[PDB]
Amino acid sequence: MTEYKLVVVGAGGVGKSALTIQLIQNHFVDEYDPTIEDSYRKQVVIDGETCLLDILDTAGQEEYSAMRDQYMRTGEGFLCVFAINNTKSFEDIHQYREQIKRVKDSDDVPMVLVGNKCDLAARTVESRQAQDLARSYGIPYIETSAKTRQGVEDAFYTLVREIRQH
Numbered sequence: 001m002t003e004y005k006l007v008v009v010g011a012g013g014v015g016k017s018a019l020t021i022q023l024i025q026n027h028f029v030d031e032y033d034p035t036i037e038d039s040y041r042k043q044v045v046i047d048g049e050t051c052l053l054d055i056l057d058t059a060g061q062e063e064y065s066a067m068r069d070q071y072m073r074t075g076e077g078f079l080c081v082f083a084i085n086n087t088k089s090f091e092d093i094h095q096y097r098e099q100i101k102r103v104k105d106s107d108d109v110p111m112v113l114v115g116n117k118c119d120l121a122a123r124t125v126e127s128r129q130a131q132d133l134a135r136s137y138g139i140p141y142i143e144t145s146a147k148t149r150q151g152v153e154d155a156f157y158t159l160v161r162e163i164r165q166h
């Protein structure tokens with residue numbers, strides 16, 4: 001079957017794993033559990049297509065920069081995740097977009113900008129600023145909460161559709 005190699009990237013603690021585990025296993029993980037590199041494979045049906053989601057949940061930490069070029073090369077589509085109550089993680093986003101474009105020799109890599117933790121009241125990144133950054137990249141902006149599941153399927157399925165239309 002058709003396989004979609006998805007990679008989730010972004011600063012430490014923004015919710016990459018909580019998003020991925022919500023999509024694949026339908027629960028919100030509240031605990032502290034830093035990732036090194038996890039892979040998730042799930043057979044699903046998206047818009048009637050039978051397909052394999054091959055998802056790589058990556059580390060936010062700098063100390064594993066050596067793994068990054070390799071997974072960026074293999075990935076077909078990226079979720080670039082920040083948290084809406086962490087301005088630094090938003091400010092960091094362009095670093096991920098820049099390294100992916102360089103390693104993939106492409107200025108149009110399938111990608112979704114994901115503003116996670118939108119269930120939280122104490123927002124410090126306004127949606128408009130994030131929507132403007134996404135527009136500047138020519139990619140969708142989607143807000144998510146791994147806690148309530150708001151936007152989760154949307155973010156991952158939109159990324160699949162970006163790959164289909166690439």
Ligand SMILES: Nc1nc2c(ncn2[C@@H]2O[C@H](COP(=O)(O)OP(=O)(O)NP(=O)(O)O)[C@@H](O)[C@H]2O)c(=O)[nH]1
Binds near residue numbers: 030032148
């Ligand atoms: N309220 C809220 N908290 C969230 C949400 N997403 C993740 N969190 C919380 O934020 C923390 C870090 O989440 P986690 O998924 O481990 O982040 P990560 O980006 O995978 N971290 P790392 O880069 O270390 O692997 C956890 O306490 C998790 O419960 C969200 O949408 N809402």
Ligand SMILES: [Mg+2]
Binds near residue numbers: 016018033057058
């Ligand atoms: Mg993680």
